[PDB]
C-alpha cells in the first residue's frame, strides 16, 4: 500500500503501482491496455520468486500472494507464452507482430532457437531492414553494422570469417530488401523463423522406464519426444487431436488417448515446479488448437 511495479515488454518499460489486493489478471489487463493489445491469449507475465526461479504469474490469484522476489520495484516480463500455428493468419495487430518479432529474434541471438548460418544471415538482414530502413550508399558506409548484435554466437564461433566479413554478407542482403516496409520486414523474419525446428517448442528433461534421459517438447501442434542429444528431430509425436487427458502425480505423467482402446502413455519428470508449467502449457496449447477449429 502502495507497491511499485515495473513490467518490461521487449521494447518498453512500464511503471505501475498495485495494492495488496491486486490480482495478476488486473496487472495483466493493465499492460494490454497500455500496450494496446487485442490478441491477449498468447501472452503472460513473468517473474522471479524468492528462490530465484523464473515463474509465470497466476492471473486468477493475488500478486502479493505468489512470492514475487521482494524488491523495489517488483520486476515483471510481458512475454509470449504461446505461439501461433501460422503468424500470417494469427498476428493481426502491428504491436502483436512487433512483440513476437523481438522475442523470437532474442531467442535466435541468445541461441535458444537453433538457426544455421546462412539462414541466420538472412534473418539478420531483415532485422537490419526493419531497423535501418532502405539501404542508402551515402548513409550506410562500410562498417555501419559494427554496433549491432546481428548473428548468434554459435554462428560467429563456427566459422573462420571475420567480423566485417559477416557484416558484408548482411549488407549485401540488406541492399536487396530495398522496397520493404518495417511491418513487412518483421513478418518475413517471422515467416522464416517459424519454420526453424526449435521454434515455438518448450523443452523438458524427462525419463522412460529405464531412466534414459530424453526431451519432451510441447508446441502448438501437439507433444513431441526427442533424443537427448537431438532437439531438432522429433522421434515420437502426439498431435493434440489424439489426446484425451494429461495429468501428473508427484514425478509421473500420464497421457490418455482418445482411442480409449489404446494404452496410456507414461513418462517421468523430476521437479514439481516444472511439472506445473508442463501441465499449463499442454492445456493452453490444446485449447488454442481446438479454438482454431471451431
Amino acid at each position: 500500500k502502495p507497491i511499485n511495479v515495473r513490467v518490461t515488454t521487449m521494447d518498453a518499460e512500464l511503471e505501475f503501482a498495485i495494492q495488496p489486493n491486486t490480482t495478476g489478471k488486473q496487472l495483466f489487463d493493465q499492460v494490454v491496455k497500455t500496450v494496446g493489445l487485442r490478441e491477449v491469449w498468447f501472452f503472460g507475465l513473468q517473474y522471479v520468486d524468492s528462490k530465484g526461479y523464473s515463474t509465470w504469474l497466476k492471473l486468477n490469484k493475488k500478486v502479493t500472494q505468489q512470492d514475487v522476489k521482494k524488491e523495489n520495484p517488483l520486476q515483471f516480463k510481458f512475454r509470449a507464452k504461446f505461439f501461433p500455428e501460422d503468424v500470417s493468419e494469427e498476428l493481426i495487430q502491428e504491436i502483436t507482430q512487433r512483440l513476437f518479432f523481438l522475442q523470437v529474434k532474442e531467442a535466435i541471438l541468445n541461441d535458444e532457437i537453433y538457426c544455421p548460418p546462412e539462414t541466420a544471415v538472412l534473418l539478420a538482414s531483415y532485422a537490419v531492414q526493419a531497423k535501418y530502413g532502405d539501404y542508402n550508399k551515402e548513409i550506410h558506409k562500410p562498417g555501419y553494422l559494427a554496433n549491432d548484435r546481428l548473428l548468434p554466437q554459435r554462428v560467429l564461433e563456427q566459422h573462420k570469417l571475420t567480423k566485417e566479413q559477416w557484416e558484408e554478407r548482411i549488407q549485401n542482403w540488406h541492399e536487396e530488401h530495398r522496397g520493404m516496409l518495417r511491418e513487412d520486414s518483421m513478418m518475413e523474419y517471422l515467416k522464416i523463423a517459424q519454420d526453424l525446428e526449435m521454434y515455438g517448442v518448450n523443452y523438458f528433461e524427462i525419463k522412460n522406464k529405464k531412466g534414459t534421459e530424453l526431451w519432451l517438447g510441447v508446441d502448438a501442434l501437439g507433444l513431441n519426444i526427442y533424443e537427448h542429444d537431438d532437439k531438432l528431430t522429433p522421434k515420437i509425436g502426439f498431435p493434440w487431436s489424439e489426446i484425451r487427458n494429461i495429468s501428473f502425480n508427484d514425478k509421473k505423467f500420464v497421457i490418455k488417448p482418445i482411442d480409449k482402446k489404446a494404452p496410456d502413455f507414461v513418462f517421468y519428470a523430476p521437479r514439481l515446479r516444472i511439472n506445473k508449467r508442463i501441465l499449463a502449457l499442454c492445456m493452453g496449447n490444446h485449447e488454442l488448437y481446438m479454438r482454431r477449429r471451431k
Binding site: T212, E227, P234, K235, G237, F267
Partner: peptide
C-alpha cells in the same frame, strides 16, 4: 520435421526402447 506417423502401442514401445 514431423514425427514419424505411428500408432500408440508403437509409441510406448519405442519410448521404452531408448
Amino acid at each position: 520435421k514431423r514425427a514419424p506417423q505411428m500408432d500408440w502401442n508403437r509409441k510406448r514401445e519405442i519410448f521404452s526402447n531408448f
